[PDB]
Amino acid sequence: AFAVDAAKAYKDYLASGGQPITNCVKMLCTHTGTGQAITVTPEANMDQESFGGASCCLYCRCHIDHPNPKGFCDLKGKYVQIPTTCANDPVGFTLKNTVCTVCGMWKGYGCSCDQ
Amino acid sequence: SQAWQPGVAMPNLYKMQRMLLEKCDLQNYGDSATLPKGIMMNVAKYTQLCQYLNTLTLAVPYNMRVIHFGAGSDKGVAPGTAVLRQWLPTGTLLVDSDLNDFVSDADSTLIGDCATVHTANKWDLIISDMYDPKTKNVTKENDSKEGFFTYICGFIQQKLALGGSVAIKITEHSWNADLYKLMGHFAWWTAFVTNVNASSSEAFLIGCNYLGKPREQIDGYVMHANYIFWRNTNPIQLSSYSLFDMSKFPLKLRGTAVMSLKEGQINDMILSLLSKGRLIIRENNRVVISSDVLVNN
Ligand SMILES: Nc1ncnc2c1ncn2[C@@H]1O[C@H](CSCc2ccc(Cl)c(C(=O)O)c2)[C@@H](O)[C@H]1O
Ligand SMILES: [Zn+2]
Ligand SMILES: [Zn+2]
């Protein structure tokens, strides 16, 4: 039943005051995009930064298996939009947040489906 | 007015000289451009390279096939690959590679010396950032370098589709005479300096629309001396300006025709279409790649 739980270890190291994972790949873009969370090309709006997806994935960056039966990555080969206020830690933000499956926005950071 | 361009291309008159090779001494050596907040040099550099490639007659077919050598950073990510994937049409097949391990947004990544990389298919665009800092030895004669340049020359001749294009990084000391000679096998060529990295002797040697035969005869020792002479006498103002206007960044999907033809069928009419960025000649089968692994104790 043993499985390394890297997501928990990183959250706990963040809460301990550890420096977030660096060198996530920030893209140049117009910042007039849709603002959706994970896209085929950079889609940051005025309130977001766009990053290369692989560089923002905990499992890619730590060289460990993705937590899924087929080992698939939702980020690699895509771009992830991160709120500018959270762009100091893109890995932590993708790890702690969820994409709304109807509108494609981050819940609590652009999703208005519940209002 | 160069400061608002993505960079500066070697002017044609400098290509026509017969200079002797000199040491490269850049007036703006050690200056740096102010990058936008949080943007890496490698992202800025590839963005400006792509902005310049937008001005050329690149063939852009459906199923475009692009391979990127030297794509790994010392932090284990691939910033240049991320820019290339942003630039290329959605659905473009992108393969990258580097000596050292890294994580990438490419469709497939091969780790190892580029001499171990083999592909079944031909390619529409080859990008190389490969560079060995051991070549920067100011205390010894600056001769043509082999290593990975030997691989790149053969890979162009064997695996670049007719009509395809290349951008290969060189510097004062990291260069190869045969690669310059191969520039004469394209419809057009230049050495392009990004405005963000203009304090460096690096340039990208760009071959535009491969013809598979010598269109012009180039002496690579002379041409590299011509390149250095240009750099020595034409200071380039460091500039980030073009990074702030990305409205027209994506490469235009031209739907360029792809045909399979055999050596005897390449006539002057075909060569003209190749030269205009209007034709790619290769098969359209599956893209299959591999890395040779040396097995030892
Ligand atoms: N024979 C060979 N076979 C395969 N690869 C080879 C090679 N000889 C050298 N290389 C590779 O060329 C690359 C040059 S640096 C490119 C780069 C990428 C990302 C960033 Cl972010 C930066 C940066 O820090 O600005 C720089 C290194 O990765 C080298 O491994
Ligand atoms: Zn991943
Ligand atoms: Zn929603």
From Swiss-Prot, chain A:
Residues bound to Zn(2+) 8: C100, C103, C111, C113
Compartments reported by the entry: Host cytoplasm, Host perinuclear region; Host cytoplasm; Host endoplasmic reticulum
Top-level taxon of origin: Viruses
Annotated ranges, domain ExoN/MTase coactivator: 1-115
Purpose: Plays a pivotal role in viral transcription by stimulating both nsp14 3'-5' exoribonuclease and nsp16 2'-O-methyltransferase activities. Therefore plays an essential role in viral mRNAs cap methylation.
Quaternary organization: Forms a dodecamer and interacts with nsp14 and nsp16; these interactions enhance nsp14 and nsp16 enzymatic activities.
Designated name of the protein: Non-structural protein 10
Organism: Severe acute respiratory syndrome coronavirus 2 (2019-nCoV)
Portion of the full sequence shown: 4271 to 4385 of 4405
UniProtKB/Swiss-Prot annotation, chain B:
Outcome, altering D129A: Complete loss of virus replication in human respiratory cells
Location relative to the cell: Host nucleus; Host cytoplasm
Range of the intact protein held here: 6800 to 7096 of 7096
Subunit annotation: Interacts with nsp10.
Protein task: Methyltransferase that mediates mRNA cap 2'-O-ribose methylation to the 5'-cap structure of viral mRNAs. N7-methyl guanosine cap is a prerequisite for binding of nsp16. Therefore, it plays an essential role in cap methylation of viral mRNAs, which is essential to evade the immune system, especially when restricted by human IFIT1 and IFIT3. May disrupt host mRNA splicing in nucleus by interacting with pre-mRNA Recognition Domains of the U1 and U2 snRNAs.
Descriptive protein name: 2'-O-methyltransferase nsp16
LRR repeats: from-to residues: 18-42
Domain Nidovirus-type SAM-dependent 2'-O-MTase: 1-295
